[PDB]
């Protein structure tokens, strides 16, 4: 399969798939610096048109924190289909634990590509019939 | 296919597809406040039963540190199969990075189904018999 | 299909599929201790051959943070394929958020396999030419 990429300018890093890695490390588009406590988006420098039928996700690598130390805001990130517009540039919402900088072309997380949820009818229900399973630890610990 | 979906009373503002949206938007089932550095569970109002061998997803929107200052705290949930019950309502598991107000209605995170892996055999071995990848960082940060 | 498994010695507790757990829960290896604020690893006490094609994701609990008071650095940890060495063992990156005490053979995060992303060429293109999406938050809150 194919994914057209444009890159924000010449002195982007170009980002590629490694053997090790199942997933594609995405890029810093410039240097950032973020306080403790404070919360950056961190531009990838990277649009992206997907394959038909497919959104990305993107992630932090398990060395980000370690690295940098931030964590992604909203989790995983959902790239949906739609976004893949010559401006839809993708970004990396961190906020920094520590005082942090990060550098231009420093690998600070990573995408992959999937199918798009089937297309789903919602069907109101007053009872659903099933017996409940409980949740939020309902299994215990040990 | 189909979802049924059981909302938790009838003022509940109902969940609804959007053409961009590959994911679809959930809503606090009430007003939640929550301070700095506390945990609350956000409800969110409705209780569903997945089509045969799926799952759900959940994240929070890249909207949902900006407008509302919270993380996910288990990153992204996983809405298994079996949470089907009457009673089997979902929430949000927030942690608050700053004072805030979620609104009744307010679209705060976002789901999608997949199907459950399948069943695997969990084979027991004394050797594994591969070269060694490492990780946390192994392939740097350049 | 079949996921082979080397714990890291005979006192580990074997992980198990539940009835209604989608993903299967993975185990603190030892016990450790985390101090509010700060970033330990949390070993889980298993290295995996999985099978061809196939990478696994790690998510907590949702009782993680209840229970343990600790949150996931990398939000999903992904375990690359080729991470299936000998010692190639899993961990749990977890930031406390309050001071906190894991044991041995606790429940701590939760695993599941998926077919990672078909190889994908990525061609270098000057403009996408598709209409602006816009993103964080253009579709708004209410
Ligand atoms: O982590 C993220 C999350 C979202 N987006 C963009 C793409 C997505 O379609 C839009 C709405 O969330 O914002 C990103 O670039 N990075
Ligand atoms: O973020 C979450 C995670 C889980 N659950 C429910 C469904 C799941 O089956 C059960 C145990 O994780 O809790 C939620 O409502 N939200
Ligand atoms: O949460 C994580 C993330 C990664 N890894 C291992 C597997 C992976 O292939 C390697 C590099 O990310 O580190 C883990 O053990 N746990
Ligand atoms: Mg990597
Ligand atoms: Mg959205
Ligand atoms: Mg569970």
Known sequence: MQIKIKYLDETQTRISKIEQGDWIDLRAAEDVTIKKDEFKLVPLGVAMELPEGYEAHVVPRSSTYKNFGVIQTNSMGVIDESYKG???????????????????????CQFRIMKKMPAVELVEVEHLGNEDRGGLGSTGTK
Chains 1, 2, 3 share one sequence.
Request: glycine content about 4%.
């Open 86 to 108: 010559d401006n839809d540039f993708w970004f990396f919402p961190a906020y920094a634990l520590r005082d942090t900088e990060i550098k231009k072309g420093d690998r600070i």
